[PDB]
Design a protein around this nucleic acid. Structure first.
Lengths: 701, 249, 511
RNA sequence: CUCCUGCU
RNA sequence: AGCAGUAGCAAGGAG
């Protein structure tokens, strides 16, 4: 007998038998080795989509510059994708856009954007992902790279007193005017760097491999920017974020019902609707930021004089950006014994030790190579302007050509659904080829292998497959049910929160909630080595509990992390375990667990099992031990300033003077206020005063 | 005499050579980015290291003096509880955790802890006193709204709460004096009659204020009436193909 | 306030990166401020329409959904790390104090007598025999002395490879030689294999009930109110009472215990070769027992990154004749005789070297989360059923409802096997676990594109007249990502048979 | 010969 | 050997 798991689809829908075709229970695919060929594939394949050869020489950077707008060498294979945008066309679609809704639209939205820009503190920059530190050329968290950037400022010339966004950005451009900038290298010597090297180093974006993506056979490269590119891009995504919130043909369950019902109310006696699920391919190599410079020069035609100059720098840094080239390749002899490593620096000199494919990639990227990087000017790589290209999607979806045959739809990052209304099928060829015409001019390449269409609602939009009446729900990641690993107390309630938020938004029928709850209970007990009292486990923790269970009167009041059973349920997922369980404990057990005088907790749920394990051991055994000295010193000074200001973790501690002067002014403030209504003693006042004067003479010296 | 202690620490920390270039060079806001220096990359597998830690015999860092004030060197059959490897802080086993929880002394603090979490015992008190009914098995669904989900009785807006905790605990650098003060200052007159004398620390008090005054408004798929009494019960009351509600009072 | 710092090099940078018909940024801004559109735009659009040469492809007239190209090459071997169907296990009643894995190993050294486990140095087939023979003898005399540390010999230093990595020389000294040590780099891809014919037997074996009862250590049931907790608890009880007895539960418990032990032995002892049992624990006649499937050997993992690929050696216990087609990577010896009362049949010892990894442990050792999609699936069927009937029919609907699975071998055309809904949940747990084993890149790409063709069959069922724009590259990608993973080739083959059975009624396909 | 590792 | 999958691991470093 043969066996076939797919036959359930013979008399079901694809809203019910579609969770069966996601292989999310297995391992995600990982990358291996260097990330060079993905980078060279991306940049050289950007230049193959340029459809040009017009080079312009440069004076700032020593390398040639190829323009990417209005210089099209229109080959006959136009089905192949192009990366060349005609600016009169897209500005015509912007003027065609704002004439649809309102009149003073972009002035209104840009004024609200600037109304939120000026009231922003730059600690907003530290709430981000990893970035690229250009001091030591590595990947660091955002606070570390910001502190090293400000450290290069306050080492170089003068100090920094900004504490806002615009003053920090102006401090960056002021850093661009300086002839020499000094920083610190590694065991902390101090070096200096020139002017052209600082321009080449602020414009350096790091490339790496996207690890753990479900949905490709071939691997892809992700790039993370520097620090001096981050705030301007944050400004642009505040502006375009407000514009995307204002639009109504951008995105996710209601808007499709409104546009489908409303365009089902816009049909004549012979017209009909056809939907087409599409997927724009090669999206990160066909959005040039020069068009963002022009369009952002059109949105901010009437906003201000500051914002008009400040929303036109992040595209200009994206128009000539560098690309890190990974770390090279490796070579070996015929016996496969010795394997030399060639980095990205000496790849020019050791060119003749490569394959066929690597040399095919490398001789057409040769006229743009720097020493360590490559010079890109026309890609928009991953991890960048995302809420701005969706505005290009909405701009294509509101073209008005003048029958009464037309289209509408819905757009996200690179996934759209298009709805067509016409009368006959050759007219459908007319209108849809007009759509691929307008997207093909404006710089958007639709993929023809991965698109289809039907008459009613049977489309696909960000993996929600909408059938004729019913709505399919999103396949979530399973390991997100178990990600905590911090406590015997702050893991299981976090898991009940994850089942909670996965239940409210998605479908998540109740049996999956009880089952997945009980499984996460099992993995919780299996990690923390705690089993129930009548189970037969005899390890080093259950011998105590099995011997001491006679002292407990009421057995089901024990904690789960101490050998109690489970009492939370489906209808009790918003209550932690202890708050259900405090009504039943022994007085010795409740007065014993809830002691704050315990050697573990001293040195969101109740923190009575909260312990801190020991750290790792490459933290004093690498060459970067002085960095651990730096984090210990910062913990010292932060414990000092927290020890003066008794409530400082509630409010963000702004100020632009210094830290020690507010400390001394606060000790004199509380010294006088608590002096005259309080203390009153001359040895204490003059002795503390003597310590403040001596500490100030020590600090000024 | 605490200002003498803080004068001793502040006089201590300025003696250092390279630490003089740390303070009085930065700003007050730099404290925020002086708090964060977590040079580890992402901790992309925390439970893996938690199982890798709890499988060892001595993974935990714990205080010495209290456990040598009360503990026992080994339990009655080979169960190790102590090490002598390293500040004077002692590595230990979670057997000392459950051992403290079964054979340790006790401090009576039940009313305090039942007063920290008044929102959550309020949730348990409202859960225990409800009644249910049968199910229905029908199609259901309605859009996403912005809903305040807690039975609070003041309803401030995440703006009067930070400002409220400034002008209640520590007013020496609280805030610039606004027009939102006056009736909230009558509430200041009420609230310093509550948080003057307690043994509970300032951070735990600043935590427990913002959960009895803040209606938590989130963006949720809602259906039926939009009372906040049934919005913490949003995930229980109805799904997509089924529905249950029969509450009388 | 309203002044940005007009610097000197940046203003020469912004003027350099403008579009081509423009000189400076000021000319660009002054043209964009006074921009009015025209209707030569439609000439550019239609002039783009003419030079296109692109036609859609209908499906009522050119219903060209041809079958996929399975590679007709050499049959793909059995590549899972353990044995599923061909297993044999020795039992003992479980003692509570002797519960750690080394204690289980020694207690089964006294239970199943290894003194009779005499192997000839000539295998039936395989590649390296003296190495595996002296390896089994050396680990057997190691377990005779009750200590898990293989002393350094030439056999282990050949098998679990020590000293087998290249000399990574940085380019700081290179000492070049005239036409000596000629070095470069070279890559291939993957080798191509064919359709597995054994996969049907192991799918059908894995969903059949095995008398050893419960296998997976689940947890206890929380108390239930007068709510829908009766419903959810009832559903967990019925589904759990079906999925505990099958062989898929036995393979999941085998992965949990064995990879648990190899995982913590990867933490506590790097740089030392261990000896780890391969076992389960399940209840026999009420008395909870443990099994013993094989012997594993670690290969001194220094797991620096999430990869690392340490060497595992598996000695396995089988009672079947081998096969040079399926059991292709194994190195079958013969051990002896085992009495099986229904007479005293043979006993073959299998050998395999392989690798595991650190990223391929937290997804293997925690693979108990394959009951999350199954209950979701059956629960969406049943809840959509009573949602379309608007009457509480669940317990009687779980018995009087059919599910078409498993067409037969000689004929396919509308000759299907309808089962009860709990046997559907048997087949669903088998397919989810089979996703959790064989996951590579190829299964990911194949599941994307099979979501496309599933969309085409649903468009075929309700007469919606689908259309596609370019079909040549479509099959170029799906035939690109079907190379050598057994589940990938197999699910493509059953996708074609779905097209045949649906071609007996609907009209978008071929024969 | 020894020491150090376990995301650097 | 093997794990692999477009390039890596199968120890690495220092005194």
């Amino acid at each position: 007998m043969e066996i076939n798991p797919y036959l359930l689809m013979l008399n079901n829908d694809i809203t019910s038998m579609i969770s069966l075709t996601y292989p999310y229970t297995g391992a995600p695919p990982m990358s291996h080795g260097t990330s060079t060929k993905y980078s060279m594939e991306t940049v050289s394949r950007t230049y193959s989509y340029s459809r040009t050869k017009k080079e312009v020489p440069s004076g700032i950077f020593p390398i040639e510059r190829r323009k990417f707008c209005n210089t099209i060498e229109d080959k006959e294979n136009l089905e192949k994708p192009n990366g060349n945008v005609d600016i009169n066309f897209m500005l015509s679609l912007a003027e065609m856009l704002e004439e649809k809704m309102g009149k003073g639209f972009f002035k209104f939205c840009a004024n609200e954007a600037e109304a939120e820009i000026l009231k922003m503190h730059f600690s907003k920059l530290t709430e981000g992902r990893q970035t690229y530190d250009w001091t030591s050329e590595r990947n660091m968290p955002a606070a570390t790279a910001l502190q090293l950037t400000v450290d290069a400022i306050q080492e170089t010339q003068g100090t920094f007193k900004g504490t806002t966004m615009v003053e920090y950005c102006n401090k960056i451009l002021e850093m661009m005017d300086w002839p020499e900038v000094k920083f610190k290298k590694v065991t902390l010597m101090i070096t200096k760097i020139g002017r052209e090297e600082f321009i080449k180093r602020i414009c350096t974006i790091n490339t790496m491999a996207k690890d753990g993506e479900r949905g490709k056979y071939k691997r892809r490269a992700i790039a993370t920017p520097g620090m001096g590119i981050r705030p301007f891009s944050k400004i642009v995504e505040t502006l375009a974020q407000k514009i995307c919130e204002r639009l109504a043909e951008s995105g996710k369950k209601a808007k499709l019902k409104t546009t489908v019902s409303s365009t089902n109310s816009k049909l004549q006696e012979g017209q009909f609707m056809v939907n087409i699920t599409g997927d724009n391919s090669k999206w990160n190599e066909c959005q040039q930021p020069e068009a963002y410079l022009a369009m952002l020069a059109y949105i901010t035609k009437d906003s201000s004089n500051l914002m008009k100059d400040l929303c036109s720098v992040a595209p200009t840094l994206f128009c000539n950006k560098y690309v890190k080239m990974g770390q090279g390749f490796r070579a070996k002899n015929k016996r496969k014994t010795k394997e030399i490593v060639i980095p990205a620096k000496k790849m020019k000199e050791r060119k003749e030790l490569m394959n066929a494919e690597w040399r095919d990639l490398f001789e057409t990227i040769e006229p743009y190579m720097d020493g360590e990087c490559c010079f890109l000017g026309g890609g928009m790589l991953m991890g960048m302007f995302n809420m701005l290209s969706t505005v290009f999607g909405v701009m294509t979806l509101n073209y008005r050509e003048e029958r009464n045959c037309y289209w509408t739809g819905l757009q996200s990052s690179d996934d759209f659904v298009l709805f067509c209304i016409s009368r006959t099928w050759p007219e459908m060829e007319m209108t849809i080829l007009k759509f691929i015409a307008v997207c093909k001019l404006m710089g958007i390449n639709m993929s023809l292998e991965k698109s289809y269409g039907c008459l009613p609602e049977l489309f696909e939009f960000t993996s929600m497959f909408f059938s004729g009446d019913f709505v399919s729900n999103i396949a979530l990641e399973l390991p997100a049910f178990t990600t905590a690993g911090m406590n015997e107390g702050t893991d299981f309630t976090a898991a009940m929160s994850v089942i909670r938020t996965n239940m409210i938004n998605n479908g998540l029928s109740p049996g999956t909630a009880l089952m997945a709850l009980r499984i996460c209970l099992q993995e919780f007990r299996a990690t923390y080595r705690v089993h129930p009292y009548d189970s037969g486990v005899k390890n080093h923790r259950m011998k105590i509990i099995r011997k001491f269970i006679e002292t407990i009167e009421n057995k089901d009041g024990l904690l789960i992390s101490d050998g109690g059973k489970l009492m939370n349920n489906i209808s009790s997922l918003h209550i932690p375990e202890e708050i259900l369980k405090e009504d039943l404990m022994d007085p010795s057990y409740r007065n014993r667990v809830f002691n704050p005088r315990n050697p573990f907790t001293q040195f969101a749920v109740v923190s009575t099992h909260s312990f801190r394990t020991r750290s790792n051991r490459t933290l004093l055994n690498t060459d970067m031990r002085a960095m651990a000295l730096e984090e210990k010193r910062y913990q010292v000074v932060c414990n000092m300033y927290r020890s003066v200001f008794e409530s400082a973790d509630v409010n963000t501690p702004i100020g632009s003077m210094s830290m020690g002067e507010a400390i001394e002014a606060k000790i004199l403030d509380r010294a006088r206020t608590q002096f005259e209504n309080g203390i009153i003693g001359g040895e204490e006042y003059s002795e503390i005063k003597r310590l403040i004067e001596d500490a100030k003479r020590q600090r000024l010296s | 005499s605490l200002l003498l202690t803080l004068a001793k620490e502040y006089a201590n920390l300025t003696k250092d050579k390279k630490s003089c270039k740390l303070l009085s060079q930065g700003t007050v806001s730099s404290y925020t980015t002086f708090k964060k220096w977590t040079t580890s990359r992402k901790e992309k597998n925390p439970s893996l290291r938690m199982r890798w830690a709890m499988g060892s015999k001595f993974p935990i860092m714990a205080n010495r003096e209290i456990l040598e004030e009360a503990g026992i060197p080994e339990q009655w059959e080979g169960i190790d509880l102590w090490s002598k490897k390293d500040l004077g802080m002692v590595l230990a086993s979670p057997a000392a955790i459950t051992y403290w929880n079964f054979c340790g002394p006790g401090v009576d603090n039940s009313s305090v802890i039942k007063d920290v979490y008044k929102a959550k015992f309020m949730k348990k008190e409202r859960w225990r006193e409800t009644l249910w009914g049968p199910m229905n098995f029908e199609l259901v669904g309605k859009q996403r709204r912005v809903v305040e989900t807690q039975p609070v009785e003041i309803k401030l807006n995440q703006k009067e709460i930070k400002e409220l905790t400034m002008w209640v605990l520590f007013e020496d650098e609280a805030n610039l004096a606004s027009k939102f003060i006056q009736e909230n200052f009558s509430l200041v007159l009420s609230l310093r009659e509550l948080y003057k004398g307690k043994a509970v620390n300032k951070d735990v008090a600043a935590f427990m204020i913002a959960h009895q005054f803040s209606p938590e408004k989130r963006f949720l798929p809602t259906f039926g009436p939009i009372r906040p009494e049934r919005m913490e019960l949003l995930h229980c009351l109805g799904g997509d193909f089924w529905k249950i509600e029969a509450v009388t009072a | 306030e309203l002044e940005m710092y007009k610097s000197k090099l940046f203003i020469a940078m912004r003027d350099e990166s403008v579009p081509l018909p423009y000189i400076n940024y000021e000319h660009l801004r002054t043209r964009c401020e006074t921009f009015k559109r025209n209707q030569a735009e439609c000439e550019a659009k239609v002039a783009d329409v003419a030079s296109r040469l692109k036609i859609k492809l209908e499906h009522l007239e050119e219903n060209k959904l041809r079958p996929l190209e399975i590679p007709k090459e050499k049959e793909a071997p059995y590549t899972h790390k353990f044995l599923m169907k061909d297993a044999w296990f020795f039992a003992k009643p479980h003692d509570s104090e002797r519960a750690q894995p080394q204690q289980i190993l020694y207690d089964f050294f006294e239970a199943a007598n290894m003194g009779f486990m005499t192997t000839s140095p000539k295998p039936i087939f395989g590649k390296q025999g003296l190495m595996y023979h002296s390896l089994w003898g050396q680990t057997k005399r190691a377990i005779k002395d009750k200590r898990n540390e293989l002393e350094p010999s030439e056999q282990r230093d050949f098998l679990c490879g020590i000293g087998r990595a290249s000399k990574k020389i940085q380019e700081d000294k290179w000492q070049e030689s005239r036409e000596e040590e000629f070095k470069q780099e070279e890559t291939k891809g993957a080798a191509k294999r064919g359709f597995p014919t054994w996969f049907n037997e192991e799918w059908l074996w894995a969903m059949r009930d095995s008398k050893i009862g419960d296998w997976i250590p689940m947890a206890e049931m929380p108390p239930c109110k007068n709510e829908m907790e009766d419903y959810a608890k009832k559903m967990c009880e019925e589904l759990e009472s079906k999925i505990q007895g099958t062989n898929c539960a036995r393979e999941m418990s085998k992965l949990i215990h064995t990879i648990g032990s190899l995982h913590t032995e990867c933490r506590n002892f790097p740089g030392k070769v261990k000896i780890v049992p391969i076992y389960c624990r399940g209840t026999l006649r009420g008395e909870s027992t443990d099994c013993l499937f094989g012997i594993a050997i670690k290969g001194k993992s220094h797991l620096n990154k999430d990869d690392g690929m340490y060497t595992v050696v598996t000695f396995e216990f089988s009672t079947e004749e081998p096969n040079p087609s399926k059991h292709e990577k194994y190195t079958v010896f013969e051990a002896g005789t085992v009495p099986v009362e229904a007479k005293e049949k043979k006993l073959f010892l299998y050998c395999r070297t392989t690798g595991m990894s650190k990223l391929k442990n937290d997804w293997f050792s925690k693979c108990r989360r394959c009951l999350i999609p199954t209950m979701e699936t059956v629960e969406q069927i049943v809840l959509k059923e009573c949602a379309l009937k608007e009457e509480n029919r669940v317990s009687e609907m779980l018995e009087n409802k059919r599910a078409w699975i498993a067409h037969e071998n000689g004929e396919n055309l509308t000759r299907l096997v309808s089962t009860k809904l709990k046997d559907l949940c048997r087949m669903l747990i088998v397919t989810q676990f089979y996703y959790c084993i064989y996951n590579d890149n190829q299964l990911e790409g194949f599941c994307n594109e099979q979501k496309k063709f599933l969309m085409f069959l649903q468009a075929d069922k309700d007469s919606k007249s689908a259309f596609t724009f370019n079909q040549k590259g479509l099959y170029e990608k799906i035939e690109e990502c079907i190379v050598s993973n057994p589940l990938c080739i197999f699910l493509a083959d059953r996708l074609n048979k779905l097209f045949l059975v649906a071609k007996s009624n609907g009209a978008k396909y071929f024969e």
